[PDB]
Structures are given as C-alpha cells and as structure tokens.
Amino acid sequence: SMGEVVMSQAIQPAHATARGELSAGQLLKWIDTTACLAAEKHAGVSCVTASVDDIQFEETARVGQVITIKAKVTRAFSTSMEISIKVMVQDMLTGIEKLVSVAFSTFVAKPVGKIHLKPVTLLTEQDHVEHNLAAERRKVRLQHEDTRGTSVQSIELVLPPHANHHGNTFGGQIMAWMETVATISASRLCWAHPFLKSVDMFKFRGPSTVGDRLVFTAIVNNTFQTCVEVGVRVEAFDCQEWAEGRGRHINSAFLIYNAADDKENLI
Amino acid sequence: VVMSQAIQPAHATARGELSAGQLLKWIDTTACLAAEKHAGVSCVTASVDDIQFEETARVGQVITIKAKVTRAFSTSMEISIKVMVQDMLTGIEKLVSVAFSTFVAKPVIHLKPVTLLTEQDHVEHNLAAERRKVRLQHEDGTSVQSIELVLPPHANHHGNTFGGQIMAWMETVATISASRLCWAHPFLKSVDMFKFRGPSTVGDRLVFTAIVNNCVEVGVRVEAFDCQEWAEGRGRHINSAFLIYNA
Amino acid sequence: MGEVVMSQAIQPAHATARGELSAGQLLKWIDTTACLAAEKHAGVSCVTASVDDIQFEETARVGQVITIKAKVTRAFSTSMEISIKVMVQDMLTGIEKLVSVAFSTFVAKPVGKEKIHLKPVTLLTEQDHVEHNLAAERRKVRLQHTSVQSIELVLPPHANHHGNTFGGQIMAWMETVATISASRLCWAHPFLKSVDMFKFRGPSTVGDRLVFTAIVNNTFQTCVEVGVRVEAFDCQEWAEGRGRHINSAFLIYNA
Numbered sequence: 001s002m003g004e005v006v007m008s009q010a011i012q013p014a015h016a017t018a019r020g021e022l023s024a025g026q027l028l029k030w031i032d033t034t035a036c037l038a039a040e041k042h043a044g045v046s047c048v049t050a051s052v053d054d055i056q057f058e059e060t061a062r063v064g065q066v067i068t069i070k071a072k073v074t075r076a077f078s079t080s081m082e083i084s085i086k087v088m089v090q091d092m093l094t095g096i097e098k099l100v101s102v103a104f105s106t107f108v109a110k111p112v113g114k115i116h117l118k119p120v121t122l123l124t125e126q127d128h129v130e131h132n133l134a135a136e137r138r139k140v141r142l143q144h145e146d147t148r149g150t151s152v153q154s155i156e157l158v159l160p161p162h163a164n165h166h167g168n169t170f171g172g173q174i175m176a177w178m179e180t181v182a183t184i185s186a187s188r189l190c191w192a193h194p195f196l197k198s199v200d201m202f203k204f205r206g207p208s209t210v211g212d213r214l215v216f217t218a219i220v221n222n223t224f225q226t227c228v229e230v231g232v233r234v235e236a237f238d239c240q241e242w243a244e245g246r247g248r249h250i251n252s253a254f255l256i257y258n259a260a261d262d263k264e265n266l267i
Numbered sequence: 268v269v270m271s272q273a274i275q276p277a278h279a280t281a282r283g284e285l286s287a288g289q290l291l292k293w294i295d296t297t298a299c300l301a302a303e304k305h306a307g308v309s310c311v312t313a314s315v316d317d318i319q320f321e322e323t324a325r326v327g328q329v330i331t332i333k334a335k336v337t338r339a340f341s342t343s344m345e346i347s348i349k350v351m352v353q354d355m356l357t358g359i360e361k362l363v364s365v366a367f368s369t370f371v372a373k374p375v376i377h378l379k380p381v382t383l384l385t386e387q388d389h390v391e392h393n394l395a396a397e398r399r400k401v402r403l404q405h406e407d408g409t410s411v412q413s414i415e416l417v418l419p420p421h422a423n424h425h426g427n428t429f430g431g432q433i434m435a436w437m438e439t440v441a442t443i444s445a446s447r448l449c450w451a452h453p454f455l456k457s458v459d460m461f462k463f464r465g466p467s468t469v470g471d472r473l474v475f476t477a478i479v480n481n482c483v484e485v486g487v488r489v490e491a492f493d494c495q496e497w498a499e500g501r502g503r504h505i506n507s508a509f510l511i512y513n514a
Numbered sequence: 515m516g517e518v519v520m521s522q523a524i525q526p527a528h529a530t531a532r533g534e535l536s537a538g539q540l541l542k543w544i545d546t547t548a549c550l551a552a553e554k555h556a557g558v559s560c561v562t563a564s565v566d567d568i569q570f571e572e573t574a575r576v577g578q579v580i581t582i583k584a585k586v587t588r589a590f591s592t593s594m595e596i597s598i599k600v601m602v603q604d605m606l607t608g609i610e611k612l613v614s615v616a617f618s619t620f621v622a623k624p625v626g627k628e629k630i631h632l633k634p635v636t637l638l639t640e641q642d643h644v645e646h647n648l649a650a651e652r653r654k655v656r657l658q659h660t661s662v663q664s665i666e667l668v669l670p671p672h673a674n675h676h677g678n679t680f681g682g683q684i685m686a687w688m689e690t691v692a693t694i695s696a697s698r699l700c701w702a703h704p705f706l707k708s709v710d711m712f713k714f715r716g717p718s719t720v721g722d723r724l725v726f727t728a729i730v731n732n733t734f735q736t737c738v739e740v741g742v743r744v745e746a747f748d749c750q751e752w753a754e755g756r757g758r759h760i761n762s763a764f765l766i767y768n769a
C-alpha cells in the first residue's frame with residue numbers, strides 16, 4: 001500500500017552452499033531484483049543498477065528458513081533513485097525472526113527510446129527524515145570518487161535469462177557471479193568453508209548486454225583477525241571485443257569473508 | 268508423449284522430497300508438448316482440473332510422466348496426465364497422479380479431431396465432453412506476499428508465460444503460509460479446479476498473495492503487471508487458486 | 515599462453531543423490547570453456563561440431579572446485595580443434611587431481627550469407643608446434659570415424675544469442691537420460707566413466723523439442739554401455755512426425 005515491494009523465498013538445496021547455508025550470491029541477486037522492481041514501480045520504465053552502498057550480513061539463512069526482502073524508493077532525483085532494502089530471516093520451526101541486513105542501493109531509469117522523474121510521496125515522519133538522509137548518503141556515494149598468490153579467474157556467458165527484456169545485464173546477476181568467484185579465492189586461505197560478511201560500496205561503471213562474456217578476476221587483498229578481504233574485478237567483451245582483447249571495465253568490488261569465527265582457520 | 272526425470276537436490280525440498288511446484292511444472296510442460304503435437308502451433312494452459320498426489324517422491328527416485336490428447340474441440344484440447352515414480356534400488360513403481368488439463372491453441376486456424384483406435388480411446392473421447400461441461404460451471408493466519416519477474420526462460424518462444432511456471436511459483440508461496448500455520452513443514456495434498464483468465468508475457472511482474480483460508484486450505488492470488496501498469500498500479504488478474512495441505 | 519579458464523564451485527544444485535557433481539553439468543561446463551576459446555579465435559558465434567573421447571579419471575564432490583582450461587591448437591577453415599583440461603580441487607584440503615584431458619571440435623557460424631576464413635594459430639612454444647602437428651592426425655581420425663524415453667523443450671538459456679542450442683546442453687540432457695537407463699538395469703546409482711567420440715549432425719534452435727531415447731547396448735560386467743539418440747523437432751515438425759537426427763552417442767557407466 002506504501003510503494004514497498006515484498007519478496008518471500010524459502011531456501012531449497014538449490015540456493016544452498018557446501019554449508020547448507022543460503023548462497024550469499026543468491027541473496028545479493030534477490031536483493032537487487034526486489035529493489036529494481038521497487039524503482040521500476042516509481043519510474044514506469046526499465047531500471048538498471050547504478051551502484052550499491054556497503055552491505056553487512058548479520059545472519060546467514062540455513063536451508064528450510066524463509067527470507068523476506070522489502071524495498072522502497074526513498075527519494076527520486078533526476079534519472080536516479082535511492083532504494084532502501086530490509087532483509088529478514090524466519091526460522092520455520094522456532095518462529096524466530098532475525099534481521100539479516102539493512103542496505104541501500106541506486107537505480108537509473110533507462111529512456112524508452114530517444115525523461116524526468118516524479119517526486120516520491122511522503123506520509124510518515126520516517127518518510128520525511130529518510131528523504132533528507134538520502135541526499136547526504138548521495139553526497140557520500142558520489143564523493144566515493146577514488147579512480148596474496150591465490151588468484152582465481154572465471155568466465156560467464158551472458159544469456160537471455162541474465163538480462164531484462166531490453167537486453168541489459170542485471171546488477172544482481174553480476175553480483176551473484178562475483179560472490180562465487182570470491183568464495184573460491186577466499187577458500188584458498190581457509191581450512192573451513194568461509195561465509196560472506198560484507199560487500200564494500202561500489203559502482204556499475206558501464207552497460208553489459210546479452211551475449212557478452214564477463215571475465216571475473218579475484219585475489220585475496222588483506223587479512224585481519226578472523227577475516228579475509230577479496231577484490232573482484234569484472235570485465236566485459238562482446239564477440240568482437242573478445243577476439244581483439246579490448247574489454248570494458250564493468251566494476252570492482254571488495255568482499256570480506258569470515259573464516260567460521262576462528263583465527264586458526266586461516267594461514 | 269513421455270517424459271522421464273530423475274530427482275536431484277536441485278529439485279528437492281528441505282527434507283529431501285521432490286518439490287510439488289517442480290512436479291506441477293514438469294506436468295504442464297508435458298501436457299503442453301502433448302497439445303503442441305496436435306495443433307501444430309504454440310499452446311497455453313487454459314485451465315487445470317483437480318490434481319491430487321497419492322505419493323510424495325524423494326531424491327534418487329525417478330518420475331515418468333505420460334500425457335495424451337483425448338479430444339480436440341474448436342480451439343481447446345483436453346489432456347490426460349499419468350505420473351509414475353520408480354525406486355532405483357527397489358524397482359517398485361507407484362502412482363503419483365491421475366489429472367486432467369485444458370489447453371488453448373494460439374495462432375499467429377482450426378484443430379482436427381485425434382486419430383481414435385482403442386475402445387479406451389472412444390471412452391475418454393466421450394467422457395471428455397462431460398468433463399468440459401464441469402470445467403465451465405465454476406461461476407460464482409497471516410498473509411504471505413511475494414513477487415516474481417518473468418524472464419525469457421519462463422515463457423515459450425513467442426513470449427507467453429508457461430502456466431506451469433505460475434503453478435510452481437504458486438506452490439512456493441502457498442507452502443510458506445501453510446508452514447506458518449503449524450510452525451512446521453507440510454506437504455501438498457491437492458490443486459483444486461481453477462482457470463487462467465488472461466495472458467502473461469516476458470517482462471511481466473507476477474505478484475502472489477497467499478492467505479490461510481480454513482488440514483489447511485491456502486488461497487493464492489496471481490496478479491500481473493506491465494512495466495507501465497506497475498507504475499500506474501492497475502494490473503490484470505491472472506488467477507486465484509486453492510491448495511490443500513497436511514502435516 | 516592463449517588459454518580460456520573457468521573456475522566453478524560445486525554446489526548441491528549441481529549434485530546428485532550421493533553428493534557428486536552431475537556429469538551432465540561437467541560436460542556442459544566443458545563445452546562452454548571450449549566454445550569460449552573458439553570464439554576468441556574466430557570473432558563470431560561458434561557451435562559444437564564434434565567431441566572426441568572424454569574419460570573421467572575422478573569424480574568431484576560438493577564443496578570442491580572444478581577448473582577448466584581450453585586452448586585452440588589449430589584452425590583449419592571453418593573448424594578448430596580445442597584442447598581441454600579439467601582439474602578438481604578440494605576447498606578444505608587444497609589437494610588437486612586430474613579429472614580429464616580431452617578434445618573437441620568447433621565450427622564458426624556465419625552471420626548472414628558470409629564466407630568465413632580463420633587465421634592460423636600463433637605458435638610460440640616447441641610444444642605449440644608439437645600440438646599443431648598432432649591436431650591433423652586427430653582430425654583425420656575424427657572424420658574417419660531396460661530403456662528410457664524423455665523430452666526437453668529448448669528455451670533461451672539453452673542456446674546462444676543467435677538461437678543455436680549449445681552442444682554442452684544436449685550433452686547434459688544426454689547423461690541425465692542415460693543414467694536412468696543405467697539405473698534401470700542394475701539397482702544401484704552408477705557413475706559415468708567415459709563418452710565415446712560423437713559428431714553433431716544437424717543444428718538445433720530455440721523452440722525445438724528434443725526427444726531422448728537410451729538403451730543398454732553392451733555389458734562387459736562392472737561396465738554397462740548405453741547408447742543415446744537425440745531427435746529434434748520444430749513446432750510444426752512435432753505435429754507431423756518428421757524430425758532430425760541430431761546425434762547418437764555411447765556412454766560407459768560404472769556400478
């Protein structure tokens with residue numbers, strides 16, 4: 001009733017990892033879908049992931065638990081929108097609901113052919129305060145203007161199910177693909193299976209489309225306490241660019257992984 | 268038209284049982300491939316009759332599905348569906364479902380009658396008329412909300428959403444509402460007579476809304492939205508459905 | 515080098531009842547890395563022409579990582595030979611093993627009514643030259659060379675952006691049907707050991723139905739050979755009966 005889009009996923013073994021936990025990559029993908037739908041409700045046209053803020057993961061959902069994602073447009077700007085993301089997890093046996101993640105993300109309306117956005121409607125006091133908090137967070141976003149022998153290369157062909165019906169590659173899918181490569185790199189240092197704690201704020205620097213090859217390069221970047229930092233770099237190539245060897249930088253993220261809450265589990 | 272699929276973790280539920288939605292999907296695909304062998308063109312699910320599951324299938328087992336066109340009408344076709352499960356260590360086979368479905372042809376033309384041969388062929392050919400009569404008569408806890416975005420793999424090559432994809436997404440949300448009643452994990456008993464009352468297409472958003480209605484009965488609502496319609500909040504009602512569970 | 519490299523973690527979604535990687539998925543992944551290598555050479559869409567002997571010396575498990583390297587060893591005119599290497603690593607132990615060394619052939623598909631002419635492969639190593647030689651001997655060999663029914667509908671993710679059904683996709687559906695037939699003979703879950711050389715005869719396309727039939731062919735005990743047929747139908751072809759022989763393959767399973 002309040003322009004809040006709601007998803008609900010039960011976690012099958014399909015979404016599961018070697019730990020029986022929900023794949024972090026999948027959560028990222030679901031978060032981006034729900035948020036996009038939130039934006040596309042405000043815009044009327046297709047919207048693409050512009051950037052993500054930092055995401056922290058408080059809990060990881062196990063198989064047999066239900067996840068509930070809620071997204072909302074907090075503020076509309078000129079072509080862009082701030083979308084707020086809440087993520088819960090409910091154990092179907094205990095009844096307990098816990099918070100997984102509060103998160104922010106940015107979407108861009110894509111022109112129909114060859115256009116301005118309406119203002120978001122504010123009813124509550126939370127609406128009016130977050131309306132202002134978005135402009136401060138936006139300053140932070142834009143000012144973010146800064147431009148180990150355990151390497152891992154992967155490659156994914158962008159098929160039609162990985163993109164909207166105009167053919168633009170989904171933000172969430174590149175994030176899902178990133179995360180699995182990152183895990184492979186992080187595991188080269190752990191004696192346990194490590195789980196994702198956070199993704200540092202990053203930007204989608206340019207478009208990707210059906211039939212691109214996305215190349216993922218991952219390396220461990222740092223070690224701290226119980227955790228390990230992995231940089232992933234994403235590059236795009238259409239069929240011709242792929243042969244010539246002149247790709248396009250799509251993004252770079254830093255994912256921080258937790259070695260099962262023990263110092264001993266990493267070298 | 269025969270389809271055999273083995274049950275793998277990809278298809279399984281939390282307790283290692285083959286997911287009902289996954290079955291419903293495999294039923295439609297096969298029931299659709301039956302219809303498409305008769306019309307020559309693409310076909311879409313018009314309606315579903317009572318489905319009832321006598322057995323639940325488990326990882327490692329194999330499901331065999333048989334579907335055939337009983338009677339072609341003016342633009343629609345009645346299809347029969349048999350569902351067998353086999354154990355690959357026992358050899359034992361068990362019946363999962365006897366179910367009927369109705370498909371409409373979608374030209375971009377008329378349909379010939381089918382080639383009848385058996386005595387049993389004629390019997391189903393006559394009883395289909397009664398069944399079509401019943402199919403047409405349908406004329407009058409906590410709410411679980413979910414949304415799904417229709418991608419290319421969720422539709423035929425012409426862009427039309429599979430009926431079976433909708434029933435699979437329907438089961439996911441219905442199970443959650445059921446689980447939320449008894450604080451446990453249940454299994455699907457049946458799918459009651461409903462009708463898909465409008466098309467759906469790639470790019471649609473399907474909003475699902477499940478509520479506990481009364482052994483439990485989950486009512487699922489499927490509402491469809493353009494990217495434009497999504498903005499204007501005026502969508503299209505695809506279907507309502509009633510699913511019954513035990514725990 | 516000139517190597518296309520893919521790394522995949524084996525989740526339960528890629529797995530079987532035991533906790534092993536489905537051979538179907540492995541084959542699909544191998545066809546992709548090889549296809550990516552061909553296209554890096556050709557600069558256009560490439561399809562699977564044929565596959566040599568593939569033998570799996572190990573099976574991987576959930577929570578392990580498969581790494582595939584693919585290289586174009588020689589280009590001819592429309593076709594290229596691709597050398598493939600598959601390794602598996604345990605994510606906890608860190609121990610690696612050879613899964614498979616195999617060979618596949620890819621053909622460059624024209625956009626319009628286009629004549630395609632592939633450039634030579636840049637040779638650097640002495641092993642490069644050795645491989646360029648032995649490619650022709652393998653190319654010559656190539657050109658010289660109870661039961662389960664199933665059906666799959668070709669959708670968008672099963673074909674490249676032009677609409678041509680991937681070789682690896684058919685190769686996946688090809689094992690999932692064979693496994694059941696091998697399960698129907700002896701009452702135990704078996705694992706795939708090798709795939710005998712087979713060619714792709716006709717192209718397939720988005721919207722097709724592929725009908726799969728498999729039978730036990732020959733059983734020298736502790737081994738059961740199972741042949742697979744693959745038959746493709748347009749939507750209209752479907753309703754009339756006349757279809758196309760895509761491929762017939764022989765799979766060796768193990769009890």
Ligand SMILES: CC(C)(COP(=O)(O)OP(=O)(O)OC[C@H]1O[C@@H](n2cnc3c(N)ncnc32)[C@H](O)[C@@H]1OP(=O)(O)O)[C@@H](O)C(=O)NCCC(=O)NCCS
Binds near residue numbers: 080203204208
């Ligand atoms: C997002 C994108 C449009 C930014 O364009 P740009 O080169 O920065 O040019 P501009 O500065 O004019 O961007 C226009 C808008 O983007 C916003 N923007 C740019 N960088 C941003 C960031 N890091 N975070 C949030 N918003 C950002 C600007 O604030 C501006 O907003 P406004 O129109 O409401 O005033 C561009 O990088 C892009 O099209 N790539 C991602 C699209 C995509 O394909 N996403 C899926 C992943 S491949």
Ligand SMILES: CC(C)(COP(=O)(O)OP(=O)(O)OC[C@H]1O[C@@H](n2cnc3c(N)ncnc32)[C@H](O)[C@@H]1OP(=O)(O)O)[C@@H](O)C(=O)NCCC(=O)NCCS
Binds near residue numbers: 590593679681715
């Ligand atoms: C395989 C195919 C290319 C062979 O074509 P053809 O009818 O035999 O005609 P040609 O022999 O002239 O084919 C041209 C090339 O195919 C090669 N060829 C044919 N079968 C081959 C095989 N078994 N192994 C290696 N090369 C083969 C020839 O050597 C020739 O090579 P060149 O052009 O580099 O000199 C063709 O039948 C085809 O399009 N197959 C299906 C491809 C496909 O769609 N696969 C994806 C999954 S269905």
Ligand SMILES: CC(C)(COP(=O)(O)OP(=O)(O)OC[C@H]1O[C@@H](n2cnc3c(N)ncnc32)[C@H](O)[C@@H]1OP(=O)(O)O)[C@H](O)C(=O)NCCC(=O)NCCS
Binds near residue numbers: 312313314428465
């Ligand atoms: C049935 C439908 C195809 C056409 O609308 P309609 O007004 O009900 O169609 P009509 O009754 O005028 O005629 C179409 C045929 O479908 C049959 N039909 C209509 N309602 C039916 C129902 N409740 N149950 C079974 N068959 C039904 C009719 O008997 C008629 O058969 P005929 O050609 O032999 O006379 C439907 O409303 C529709 O367009 N939705 C298609 C569903 C779809 O797109 N696929 C599923 C994913 S959304």
